Short mmCIF file of C-alpha atoms and ligand atoms in Angstrom, two decimals:
data_model
loop_
_atom_site.label_atom_id
_atom_site.label_comp_id
_atom_site.label_asym_id
_atom_site.label_seq_id
_atom_site.Cartn_x
_atom_site.Cartn_y
_atom_site.Cartn_z
CA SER A 3 23.32 -0.48 -22.43
CA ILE A 4 26.45 0.09 -20.23
CA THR A 5 29.00 2.69 -20.96
CA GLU A 6 32.51 3.15 -19.50
CA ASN A 7 33.66 6.41 -17.81
CA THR A 8 37.48 6.85 -17.96
CA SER A 9 37.71 9.21 -15.39
CA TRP A 10 36.25 7.28 -12.57
CA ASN A 11 39.30 4.99 -12.78
CA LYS A 12 41.42 7.56 -10.96
CA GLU A 13 39.44 6.69 -7.53
CA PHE A 14 40.55 3.11 -7.75
CA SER A 15 44.37 3.90 -8.82
CA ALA A 16 44.68 6.02 -5.84
CA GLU A 17 43.91 3.25 -3.33
CA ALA A 18 45.36 0.47 -5.62
CA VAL A 19 41.92 -1.05 -5.53
CA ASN A 20 40.52 -3.82 -8.31
CA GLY A 21 36.81 -3.04 -8.35
CA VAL A 22 33.99 -1.71 -10.31
CA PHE A 23 31.19 1.05 -9.67
CA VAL A 24 28.01 0.97 -11.87
CA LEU A 25 25.81 4.29 -11.61
CA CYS A 26 22.34 4.67 -13.67
CA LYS A 27 19.99 7.88 -13.60
CA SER A 28 16.45 7.51 -13.84
CA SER A 29 16.48 3.59 -14.59
CA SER A 30 18.78 0.77 -15.68
CA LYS A 31 18.31 1.62 -19.64
CA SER A 32 21.67 3.61 -19.63
CA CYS A 33 24.34 2.86 -16.94
CA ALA A 34 27.86 4.01 -16.50
CA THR A 35 30.71 2.17 -15.19
CA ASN A 36 34.60 2.07 -14.73
CA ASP A 37 34.87 -1.33 -16.41
CA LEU A 38 32.44 -2.85 -18.98
CA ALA A 39 33.58 -6.17 -18.07
CA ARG A 40 33.58 -6.22 -14.25
CA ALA A 41 30.24 -4.61 -14.13
CA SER A 42 28.66 -7.81 -15.39
CA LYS A 43 30.76 -10.27 -13.51
CA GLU A 44 29.09 -11.99 -10.64
CA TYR A 45 30.13 -12.34 -7.28
CA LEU A 46 29.11 -13.81 -3.87
CA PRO A 47 26.55 -11.25 -2.50
CA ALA A 48 27.14 -11.73 1.09
CA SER A 49 25.22 -9.56 3.15
CA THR A 50 23.74 -7.52 0.22
CA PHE A 51 21.63 -10.69 0.32
CA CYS A 52 19.72 -9.33 3.34
CA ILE A 53 17.58 -7.42 0.98
CA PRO A 54 15.84 -10.31 -1.16
CA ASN A 55 16.08 -12.56 1.90
CA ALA A 56 13.92 -9.84 4.11
CA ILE A 57 11.40 -9.43 1.26
CA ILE A 58 11.08 -13.33 0.98
CA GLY A 59 10.73 -13.45 4.57
CA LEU A 60 7.78 -11.09 4.81
CA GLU A 61 6.25 -12.56 1.64
CA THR A 62 6.02 -16.02 3.29
CA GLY A 63 5.07 -14.77 6.73
CA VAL A 64 8.03 -16.10 8.08
CA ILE A 65 8.52 -12.52 9.27
CA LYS A 66 5.01 -11.64 10.70
CA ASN A 67 5.40 -7.87 9.95
CA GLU A 68 6.85 -4.57 10.07
CA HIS A 69 7.18 -4.59 13.66
CA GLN A 70 8.52 -8.13 14.56
CA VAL A 71 11.44 -8.49 17.09
CA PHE A 72 14.03 -10.95 16.53
CA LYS A 73 14.48 -12.25 19.96
CA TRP A 74 18.15 -13.28 20.91
CA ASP A 75 18.21 -16.52 22.68
CA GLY A 76 21.25 -15.53 24.80
CA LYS A 77 23.53 -17.97 23.21
CA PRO A 78 26.82 -16.66 21.72
CA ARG A 79 26.78 -15.11 18.26
CA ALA A 80 29.84 -14.28 16.19
CA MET A 81 29.46 -10.50 16.78
CA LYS A 82 28.76 -8.54 19.94
CA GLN A 83 26.43 -6.45 18.18
CA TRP A 84 24.32 -9.20 17.16
CA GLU A 85 23.77 -10.16 20.83
CA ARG A 86 20.52 -8.45 21.48
CA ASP A 87 17.07 -8.35 20.22
CA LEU A 88 16.79 -6.75 16.99
CA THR A 89 14.01 -5.40 14.84
CA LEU A 90 14.18 -5.64 11.00
CA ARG A 91 15.97 -2.44 10.37
CA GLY A 92 18.15 -3.18 13.37
CA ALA A 93 18.91 -6.49 11.57
CA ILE A 94 19.60 -5.21 8.53
CA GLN A 95 21.56 -2.32 9.69
CA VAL A 96 24.23 -4.38 11.45
CA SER A 97 24.20 -7.40 8.89
CA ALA A 98 22.72 -10.00 11.73
CA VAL A 99 23.67 -13.11 10.06
CA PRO A 100 22.17 -15.35 12.29
CA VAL A 101 18.95 -13.62 12.10
CA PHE A 102 19.11 -14.03 8.33
CA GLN A 103 20.17 -17.53 8.61
CA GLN A 104 17.05 -18.74 10.92
CA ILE A 105 14.94 -16.65 8.28
CA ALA A 106 16.32 -18.59 5.47
CA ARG A 107 16.05 -21.98 7.20
CA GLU A 108 12.12 -21.10 7.65
CA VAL A 109 11.71 -20.04 4.16
CA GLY A 110 13.17 -23.44 3.14
CA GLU A 111 14.91 -24.47 -0.41
CA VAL A 112 11.82 -24.81 -2.53
CA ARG A 113 10.30 -21.18 -1.70
CA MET A 114 13.84 -19.71 -1.76
CA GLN A 115 14.62 -20.77 -5.24
CA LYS A 116 11.07 -19.93 -6.47
CA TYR A 117 11.51 -16.32 -5.14
CA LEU A 118 15.26 -15.84 -6.56
CA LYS A 119 13.88 -17.13 -9.84
CA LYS A 120 10.86 -14.55 -9.64
CA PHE A 121 13.37 -11.70 -8.63
CA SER A 122 16.11 -12.75 -11.50
CA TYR A 123 18.51 -12.30 -8.43
CA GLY A 124 21.94 -13.42 -10.09
CA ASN A 125 22.63 -16.97 -11.06
CA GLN A 126 19.98 -18.08 -8.84
CA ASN A 127 21.91 -20.69 -7.52
CA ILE A 128 20.98 -21.58 -3.71
CA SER A 129 23.13 -24.63 -3.39
CA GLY A 130 25.58 -25.17 -0.60
CA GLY A 131 23.21 -25.28 2.32
CA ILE A 132 19.93 -23.38 3.09
CA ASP A 133 21.72 -21.26 5.78
CA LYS A 134 24.65 -20.12 4.19
CA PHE A 135 24.52 -20.27 0.12
CA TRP A 136 24.75 -16.46 -0.03
CA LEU A 137 28.07 -16.35 2.49
CA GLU A 138 30.08 -19.28 1.12
CA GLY A 139 27.89 -21.23 -1.34
CA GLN A 140 27.57 -20.88 -5.17
CA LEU A 141 25.12 -17.94 -5.74
CA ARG A 142 26.60 -15.21 -7.46
CA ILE A 143 25.34 -11.69 -8.82
CA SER A 144 26.75 -8.65 -10.50
CA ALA A 145 26.83 -4.89 -10.01
CA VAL A 146 24.54 -4.42 -13.13
CA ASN A 147 22.32 -7.28 -11.73
CA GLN A 148 22.12 -5.45 -8.34
CA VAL A 149 21.08 -2.25 -9.89
CA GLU A 150 18.20 -3.90 -11.91
CA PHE A 151 16.93 -5.46 -8.86
CA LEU A 152 17.07 -2.40 -6.60
CA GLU A 153 15.58 -0.62 -9.45
CA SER A 154 12.60 -2.90 -9.37
CA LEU A 155 12.21 -2.66 -5.52
CA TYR A 156 12.25 1.06 -5.87
CA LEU A 157 9.26 0.85 -8.24
CA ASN A 158 7.36 -1.56 -6.05
CA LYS A 159 7.87 -3.80 -9.23
CA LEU A 160 9.10 -7.28 -7.45
CA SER A 161 6.76 -10.07 -6.90
CA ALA A 162 5.70 -9.24 -3.56
CA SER A 163 3.17 -6.81 -2.00
CA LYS A 164 3.83 -3.35 -2.42
CA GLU A 165 3.52 -2.98 1.33
CA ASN A 166 6.33 -5.50 1.91
CA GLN A 167 8.50 -3.60 -0.49
CA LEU A 168 7.87 -0.31 1.33
CA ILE A 169 8.82 -2.05 4.74
CA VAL A 170 12.06 -3.19 3.22
CA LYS A 171 12.80 0.17 1.59
CA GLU A 172 12.34 1.76 4.83
CA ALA A 173 14.55 -0.41 6.77
CA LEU A 174 17.30 0.30 4.06
CA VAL A 175 17.41 4.23 4.68
CA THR A 176 21.06 4.79 5.55
CA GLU A 177 21.09 8.79 5.01
CA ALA A 178 18.52 11.55 5.24
CA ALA A 179 19.13 15.08 4.08
CA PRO A 180 16.56 17.65 3.22
CA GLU A 181 17.95 17.67 -0.47
CA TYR A 182 18.20 13.64 -0.79
CA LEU A 183 17.64 10.31 0.66
CA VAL A 184 20.29 7.56 0.58
CA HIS A 185 19.08 3.66 0.79
CA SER A 186 22.05 1.40 0.81
CA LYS A 187 23.28 -1.85 2.00
CA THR A 188 27.04 -3.35 2.62
CA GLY A 189 28.22 -6.76 2.18
CA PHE A 190 31.57 -8.17 2.96
CA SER A 191 32.33 -12.11 2.18
CA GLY A 192 35.79 -12.27 4.13
CA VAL A 193 39.55 -11.87 3.35
CA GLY A 194 40.08 -15.02 1.23
CA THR A 195 43.74 -14.78 0.27
CA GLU A 196 45.87 -12.74 -1.86
CA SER A 197 45.80 -15.43 -4.61
CA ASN A 198 42.06 -15.50 -4.22
CA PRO A 199 40.60 -12.56 -2.47
CA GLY A 200 37.29 -11.91 -0.89
CA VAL A 201 34.70 -9.29 -2.35
CA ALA A 202 33.27 -6.16 -0.59
CA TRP A 203 29.83 -4.45 -1.73
CA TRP A 204 27.97 -1.27 -1.14
CA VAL A 205 24.82 -1.23 -3.24
CA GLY A 206 21.56 1.13 -3.10
CA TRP A 207 20.15 4.35 -4.76
CA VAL A 208 19.78 7.90 -4.13
CA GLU A 209 16.48 9.95 -4.46
CA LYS A 210 17.42 13.65 -5.21
CA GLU A 211 15.06 16.25 -6.17
CA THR A 212 12.65 14.67 -8.69
CA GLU A 213 15.63 12.54 -10.02
CA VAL A 214 16.84 8.99 -8.81
CA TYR A 215 20.32 7.01 -8.97
CA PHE A 216 20.87 3.48 -8.76
CA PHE A 217 24.45 2.23 -7.57
CA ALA A 218 26.54 -0.66 -6.93
CA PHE A 219 30.07 -1.17 -6.21
CA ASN A 220 32.22 -3.96 -5.54
CA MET A 221 36.05 -4.76 -4.97
CA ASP A 222 38.53 -7.16 -4.11
CA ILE A 223 39.45 -7.24 -0.56
CA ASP A 224 42.20 -9.27 1.12
CA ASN A 225 42.44 -7.01 4.39
CA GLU A 226 39.71 -5.97 6.52
CA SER A 227 41.55 -2.75 7.14
CA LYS A 228 40.50 -1.83 3.60
CA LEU A 229 36.83 -2.29 4.24
CA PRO A 230 36.12 1.64 4.27
CA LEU A 231 37.04 2.23 0.78
CA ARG A 232 33.93 0.04 -0.29
CA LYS A 233 32.15 3.47 0.94
CA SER A 234 34.65 6.04 0.36
CA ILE A 235 35.36 5.37 -3.26
CA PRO A 236 31.88 5.22 -4.47
CA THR A 237 30.85 8.15 -2.24
CA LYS A 238 33.69 10.19 -4.07
CA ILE A 239 32.55 9.36 -7.36
CA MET A 240 28.82 10.45 -6.39
CA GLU A 241 30.17 13.49 -4.68
CA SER A 242 31.94 14.51 -7.85
CA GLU A 243 29.04 13.96 -10.03
CA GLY A 244 26.66 16.07 -7.50
CA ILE A 245 24.67 13.45 -6.71
CA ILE A 246 25.36 13.77 -2.73
CA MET B 1 -0.76 6.59 25.65
CA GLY B 2 -1.38 5.29 29.18
CA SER B 3 0.35 7.82 31.56
CA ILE B 4 2.09 10.90 31.78
CA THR B 5 4.14 12.41 34.51
CA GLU B 6 5.91 15.93 34.88
CA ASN B 7 9.65 16.30 35.12
CA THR B 8 10.29 19.93 35.55
CA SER B 9 13.99 19.33 35.49
CA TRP B 10 13.56 19.47 31.54
CA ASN B 11 12.76 23.50 32.14
CA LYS B 12 16.59 23.77 32.18
CA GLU B 13 16.90 24.25 28.56
CA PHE B 14 14.03 26.54 28.24
CA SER B 15 15.10 28.64 30.92
CA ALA B 16 18.86 28.71 29.46
CA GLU B 17 17.19 30.35 26.25
CA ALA B 18 14.56 32.21 27.70
CA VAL B 19 11.94 30.33 26.13
CA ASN B 20 8.28 29.50 27.15
CA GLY B 21 7.29 25.96 25.36
CA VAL B 22 6.53 22.40 26.31
CA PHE B 23 8.21 18.94 25.20
CA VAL B 24 6.16 15.76 25.53
CA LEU B 25 8.26 12.32 25.23
CA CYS B 26 6.80 9.01 25.39
CA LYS B 27 8.23 5.34 25.46
CA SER B 28 6.07 3.33 23.37
CA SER B 29 6.78 0.11 25.19
CA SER B 30 5.92 1.31 28.53
CA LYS B 31 3.05 3.69 26.97
CA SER B 32 4.19 6.18 29.51
CA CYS B 33 4.87 9.81 28.83
CA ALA B 34 6.90 12.65 30.17
CA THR B 35 6.69 16.42 29.92
CA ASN B 36 8.38 19.62 31.36
CA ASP B 37 4.83 21.15 31.78
CA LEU B 38 1.45 19.23 32.57
CA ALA B 39 -0.45 22.38 31.62
CA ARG B 40 1.11 23.67 28.31
CA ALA B 41 1.31 19.87 27.18
CA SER B 42 -2.57 20.02 27.15
CA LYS B 43 -2.86 23.40 25.41
CA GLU B 44 -3.93 23.61 21.85
CA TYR B 45 -2.29 25.60 19.08
CA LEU B 46 -2.27 25.90 15.39
CA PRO B 47 -0.76 22.68 13.73
CA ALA B 48 0.62 24.94 10.95
CA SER B 49 2.92 22.74 8.80
CA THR B 50 2.70 19.72 10.91
CA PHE B 51 -0.55 19.49 9.43
CA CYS B 52 1.30 18.25 6.25
CA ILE B 53 0.95 14.75 7.99
CA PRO B 54 -2.65 14.04 7.98
CA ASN B 55 -3.14 16.12 4.73
CA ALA B 56 -0.62 13.99 2.83
CA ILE B 57 -2.42 10.99 4.38
CA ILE B 58 -5.93 12.17 3.46
CA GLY B 59 -4.48 13.13 -0.15
CA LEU B 60 -3.43 9.53 -0.72
CA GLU B 61 -6.30 8.08 0.76
CA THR B 62 -8.88 10.00 -1.68
CA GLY B 63 -6.31 9.29 -4.35
CA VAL B 64 -5.86 13.06 -4.71
CA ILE B 65 -2.16 12.25 -4.39
CA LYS B 66 -1.67 9.10 -6.76
CA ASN B 67 1.49 7.85 -4.96
CA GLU B 68 4.98 8.35 -3.53
CA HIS B 69 6.22 8.71 -7.17
CA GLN B 70 3.75 11.49 -7.84
CA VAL B 71 5.55 14.79 -8.87
CA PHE B 72 4.11 17.96 -8.12
CA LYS B 73 4.89 20.22 -11.08
CA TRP B 74 5.67 23.87 -10.63
CA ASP B 75 3.64 25.94 -12.81
CA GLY B 76 6.57 28.68 -12.94
CA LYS B 77 4.36 31.40 -11.36
CA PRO B 78 6.33 32.97 -8.43
CA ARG B 79 5.56 31.55 -5.04
CA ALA B 80 6.20 33.08 -1.55
CA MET B 81 9.57 31.19 -1.07
CA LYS B 82 12.45 30.42 -3.70
CA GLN B 83 12.68 26.60 -2.31
CA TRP B 84 9.06 26.00 -3.45
CA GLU B 85 9.65 27.14 -7.13
CA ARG B 86 10.84 23.62 -8.55
CA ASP B 87 8.99 20.53 -9.01
CA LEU B 88 8.47 18.32 -6.04
CA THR B 89 7.93 14.75 -4.80
CA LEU B 90 5.54 14.18 -1.83
CA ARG B 91 8.78 13.91 0.48
CA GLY B 92 10.33 17.02 -1.23
CA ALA B 93 7.10 18.97 -0.57
CA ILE B 94 6.89 17.81 3.06
CA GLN B 95 10.51 18.50 3.64
CA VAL B 96 10.22 22.01 2.71
CA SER B 97 6.93 22.69 3.93
CA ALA B 98 5.41 23.68 0.32
CA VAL B 99 2.42 25.48 1.46
CA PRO B 100 0.80 25.84 -2.05
CA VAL B 101 1.10 22.12 -2.58
CA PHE B 102 -0.88 21.16 0.48
CA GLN B 103 -3.56 24.02 -0.19
CA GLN B 104 -3.96 22.53 -3.74
CA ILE B 105 -4.42 19.25 -2.18
CA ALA B 106 -6.96 20.38 0.46
CA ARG B 107 -9.14 22.01 -2.20
CA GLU B 108 -9.29 18.75 -4.05
CA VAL B 109 -10.13 16.79 -1.00
CA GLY B 110 -12.91 19.32 -0.09
CA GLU B 111 -14.64 20.11 3.20
CA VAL B 112 -16.95 17.13 3.70
CA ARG B 113 -13.92 14.64 3.20
CA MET B 114 -11.31 16.40 5.11
CA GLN B 115 -14.04 16.90 8.06
CA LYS B 116 -14.69 13.23 8.10
CA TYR B 117 -10.83 12.16 8.16
CA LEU B 118 -9.96 14.62 11.02
CA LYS B 119 -12.75 12.90 12.72
CA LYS B 120 -11.38 9.52 12.21
CA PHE B 121 -7.91 10.71 13.36
CA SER B 122 -9.22 12.56 16.32
CA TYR B 123 -7.06 15.51 15.33
CA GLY B 124 -7.23 18.19 17.53
CA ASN B 125 -10.54 20.27 18.00
CA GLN B 126 -11.37 19.10 14.33
CA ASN B 127 -12.17 22.60 13.35
CA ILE B 128 -11.74 23.20 9.65
CA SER B 129 -13.47 26.64 9.43
CA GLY B 130 -11.81 29.44 7.87
CA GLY B 131 -11.44 28.41 4.20
CA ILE B 132 -10.61 24.77 3.15
CA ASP B 133 -7.21 25.94 2.19
CA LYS B 134 -5.97 27.77 5.23
CA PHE B 135 -7.75 26.53 8.38
CA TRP B 136 -4.43 24.98 9.54
CA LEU B 137 -2.40 28.11 8.84
CA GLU B 138 -4.78 30.96 10.00
CA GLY B 139 -7.89 29.35 10.85
CA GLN B 140 -9.74 27.84 13.95
CA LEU B 141 -7.86 24.42 14.12
CA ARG B 142 -5.81 23.79 17.18
CA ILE B 143 -4.09 20.58 18.37
CA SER B 144 -1.97 19.74 21.77
CA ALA B 145 1.30 18.14 22.18
CA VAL B 146 -0.34 15.21 23.60
CA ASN B 147 -2.86 15.01 20.78
CA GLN B 148 0.14 15.01 18.41
CA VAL B 149 1.86 12.18 20.08
CA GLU B 150 -1.21 9.84 20.03
CA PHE B 151 -1.67 10.69 16.40
CA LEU B 152 1.99 9.79 15.74
CA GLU B 153 1.74 6.53 17.66
CA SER B 154 -1.28 5.71 15.51
CA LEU B 155 0.55 6.47 12.40
CA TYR B 156 3.72 4.34 13.47
CA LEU B 157 1.36 1.40 14.11
CA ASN B 158 -0.51 1.71 11.08
CA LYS B 159 -3.52 2.03 13.22
CA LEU B 160 -4.98 5.11 11.52
CA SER B 161 -8.11 4.68 9.35
CA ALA B 162 -6.28 4.67 6.20
CA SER B 163 -4.44 1.86 4.08
CA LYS B 164 -1.32 0.55 5.40
CA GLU B 165 0.46 1.30 2.02
CA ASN B 166 -0.78 4.79 2.30
CA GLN B 167 0.71 5.22 5.98
CA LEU B 168 3.91 3.42 4.90
CA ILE B 169 4.09 5.93 2.08
CA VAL B 170 3.86 8.97 4.49
CA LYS B 171 6.33 7.41 7.30
CA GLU B 172 8.89 7.11 4.80
CA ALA B 173 8.49 10.69 3.58
CA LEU B 174 9.00 11.64 6.97
CA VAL B 175 12.50 10.35 7.55
CA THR B 176 14.67 13.28 8.63
CA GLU B 177 17.76 11.57 10.06
CA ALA B 178 19.40 8.12 9.80
CA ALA B 179 21.81 6.37 11.76
CA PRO B 180 22.78 2.59 12.30
CA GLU B 181 21.31 2.68 15.85
CA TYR B 182 18.45 4.91 15.39
CA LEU B 183 15.91 6.41 12.94
CA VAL B 184 14.33 9.76 13.28
CA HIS B 185 10.92 10.72 11.65
CA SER B 186 9.74 14.35 12.15
CA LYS B 187 7.99 17.35 10.95
CA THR B 188 8.52 21.09 11.80
CA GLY B 189 5.65 23.84 11.83
CA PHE B 190 5.69 27.64 12.47
CA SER B 191 2.76 29.79 12.37
CA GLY B 192 4.39 33.24 12.15
CA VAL B 193 5.67 35.67 14.60
CA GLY B 194 2.49 36.96 15.79
CA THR B 195 3.13 39.55 18.40
CA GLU B 196 5.20 40.09 21.72
CA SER B 197 1.67 40.18 23.25
CA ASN B 198 0.17 37.45 20.77
CA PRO B 199 3.24 35.17 20.04
CA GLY B 200 2.98 32.70 17.21
CA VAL B 201 3.87 29.01 17.84
CA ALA B 202 6.61 26.79 16.35
CA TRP B 203 6.67 22.92 16.52
CA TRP B 204 8.95 19.94 15.91
CA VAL B 205 6.93 16.40 16.35
CA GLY B 206 8.15 13.19 15.35
CA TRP B 207 9.42 9.68 16.57
CA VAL B 208 12.56 8.15 17.17
CA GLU B 209 13.34 4.14 16.41
CA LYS B 210 16.33 2.82 18.39
CA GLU B 211 17.25 -0.46 19.12
CA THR B 212 13.69 -2.13 19.77
CA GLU B 213 12.38 1.01 21.46
CA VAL B 214 10.20 3.79 19.91
CA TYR B 215 9.84 7.18 21.37
CA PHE B 216 7.36 9.57 20.15
CA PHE B 217 7.87 13.45 20.71
CA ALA B 218 5.88 16.71 20.37
CA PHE B 219 7.78 20.13 20.98
CA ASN B 220 5.97 23.59 20.71
CA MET B 221 7.18 27.03 21.98
CA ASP B 222 5.97 30.69 21.71
CA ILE B 223 7.96 32.45 19.16
CA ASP B 224 7.89 36.28 18.43
CA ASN B 225 11.25 36.63 16.67
CA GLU B 226 12.46 34.42 13.59
CA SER B 227 15.89 34.43 15.50
CA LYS B 228 14.63 31.85 17.80
CA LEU B 229 13.48 29.26 15.27
CA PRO B 230 16.36 26.83 15.55
CA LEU B 231 15.38 26.24 19.09
CA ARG B 232 12.42 24.29 18.09
CA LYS B 233 14.93 21.70 17.10
CA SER B 234 17.93 22.24 19.48
CA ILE B 235 16.12 22.23 22.79
CA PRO B 236 14.31 18.81 22.05
CA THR B 237 17.41 17.53 20.73
CA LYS B 238 19.45 18.36 23.92
CA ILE B 239 16.74 16.65 25.88
CA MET B 240 16.71 13.34 23.78
CA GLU B 241 20.48 13.33 24.02
CA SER B 242 20.53 13.87 27.53
CA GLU B 243 18.11 10.59 27.86
CA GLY B 244 20.47 8.72 25.80
CA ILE B 245 17.89 8.33 22.82
CA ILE B 246 19.92 10.29 19.87
C1 LIG C 1 27.57 -9.65 5.43
O1 LIG C 1 28.26 -9.14 4.84
C2 LIG C 1 28.18 -10.21 6.91
N1 LIG C 1 29.32 -10.81 6.59
C3 LIG C 1 29.74 -11.95 6.78
O2 LIG C 1 28.85 -12.85 6.89
C4 LIG C 1 31.15 -12.72 6.50
N2 LIG C 1 31.00 -14.01 6.66
C5 LIG C 1 32.17 -12.07 7.64
C6 LIG C 1 32.85 -11.09 7.32
C7 LIG C 1 33.66 -10.33 8.42
C8 LIG C 1 33.32 -10.58 9.50
C9 LIG C 1 32.20 -11.38 9.80
C10 LIG C 1 31.48 -11.92 9.30
C11 LIG C 1 28.36 -9.20 7.86
N3 LIG C 1 28.87 -8.01 6.96
C12 LIG C 1 30.02 -7.41 7.55
C13 LIG C 1 30.33 -6.43 7.34
O3 LIG C 1 29.49 -5.70 6.57
O4 LIG C 1 31.48 -5.51 7.59
C14 LIG C 1 29.97 -7.83 9.19
C15 LIG C 1 31.32 -7.84 9.85
C16 LIG C 1 29.09 -6.78 9.65
S1 LIG C 1 29.44 -9.45 9.24
C1 LIG C 2 4.71 25.67 8.02
O1 LIG C 2 4.77 25.95 9.02
C2 LIG C 2 4.64 26.80 6.96
N1 LIG C 2 4.54 28.10 7.66
C3 LIG C 2 3.82 29.27 7.48
O2 LIG C 2 3.14 29.26 6.23
C4 LIG C 2 3.67 30.40 8.18
N2 LIG C 2 2.23 31.01 7.82
C5 LIG C 2 4.65 31.29 7.94
C6 LIG C 2 5.29 31.93 8.94
C7 LIG C 2 6.27 32.82 8.80
C8 LIG C 2 6.71 33.15 7.42
C9 LIG C 2 6.16 32.80 6.29
C10 LIG C 2 5.10 31.55 6.63
C11 LIG C 2 6.10 26.79 6.35
N3 LIG C 2 6.97 26.75 7.33
C12 LIG C 2 7.73 28.05 7.75
C13 LIG C 2 9.10 27.59 8.45
O3 LIG C 2 9.33 26.48 8.64
O4 LIG C 2 9.94 28.54 8.50
C14 LIG C 2 7.96 28.53 6.44
C15 LIG C 2 8.11 30.11 6.59
C16 LIG C 2 9.32 27.75 5.52
S1 LIG C 2 6.55 28.42 5.37
#
């Protein structure tokens, strides 16, 4: 069940952004959103994919453990912040595509397909190349599906060891206050064009007091300068709901 | 750890605030440690609330605490601090130092088991006399800054005699600051103000994961006035900043 909250629209109008935000208290039974249609519309996950990719890496033993260091070979990578040795959290935090690309090759198509089917992860379409299907391929997932997936990870109810789920959850912490903890992950596919814009994501959950909130945001983006709105619009919405 | 080295330069921030105390900082890759004062680094003090860390691990491991999603329900009967009068998750109890919560956990663990696990953890003098529900607050239990960093390293590496899953549960509960380049896990403690002649102690212990390095730390200081309590974070923090760690 998803309900439309009219007042959340103000935040998108301000910035002239087309997107959606989905927010759920306690569980994904009752969610609220600014747009019913766009909530269940599926988009390329881009780097929000790090999350199932990491779980599957651990599960398959491609990632040996919590403390493994992904060594840089010294060959050029597409961003300078990727040009260094990285732990798992480091790689998640800076969206180190090359690291996740090598994890995906090692997992292979067959296991990758099996796990996204196990995880009900979006359209579960991994075609287009094993090291790029989440970046430019045909894989697609909605804000609503993201919240369900993160809810299952929160409850240790994904098909993976509780241990591997805990390791990933800790790698995902992005903000810690006495009153609450935020785990979240960004994604950005690219600019595309004006006639066909890329998509930008922010997804995660907030543990506050004894309560938990799951969120997922995306928006059309045709200019990298618009990128901060992927955090600032949903932060505004949560700040105004007293969640952060 | 494998080695320790005195660096008296760190006495700077202590003198500046008229404070007697110690900071112990170790680099996990090199296994080597530095401190402003070797002597005080080895001296043993009441853990106070830093003891929440083994207490929570022992609670999980004996099954007294069910899991991280366990809620510790407030009965409603007034408690010693307003922030304790609310339901609390494990993290919640750790974060505000909810004494009565850990007292109940200790009571259900019991003396025999508590004794056992402090032996496994090599936790300080392992002395739990004084009542199973206050030995860490007003009893005979003492631990040093050095012992504290060794115990943390073990927790970090999942080497304590407890399940990896239970160690992970507590490790997450301990996160107190997050940033893209580093994660801090830590826990404070404060025994009380004691006296000008017999001061109390305040602690800040923890670890920082930055790039591919991990730094373990333990701070303690004498305290005879609550006005000085924020020093237990501001001094170690200035030192880790000057070392480029946070
Ligand atoms: C995940 O979303 C990654 N994005 C991509 O791989 C895109 N192909 C890309 C877009 C822009 C620049 C480089 C690659 C990472 N996400 C971006 C972000 O979160 O801002 C990134 C720049 C860190 S790469
Ligand atoms: C852990 O350190 C706890 N401290 C105590 O229970 C002391 N016995 C105490 C000292 C002074 C006043 C009241 C109790 C908790 N941590 C303290 C703190 O961090 O300030 C506390 C006072 C919140 S209780």
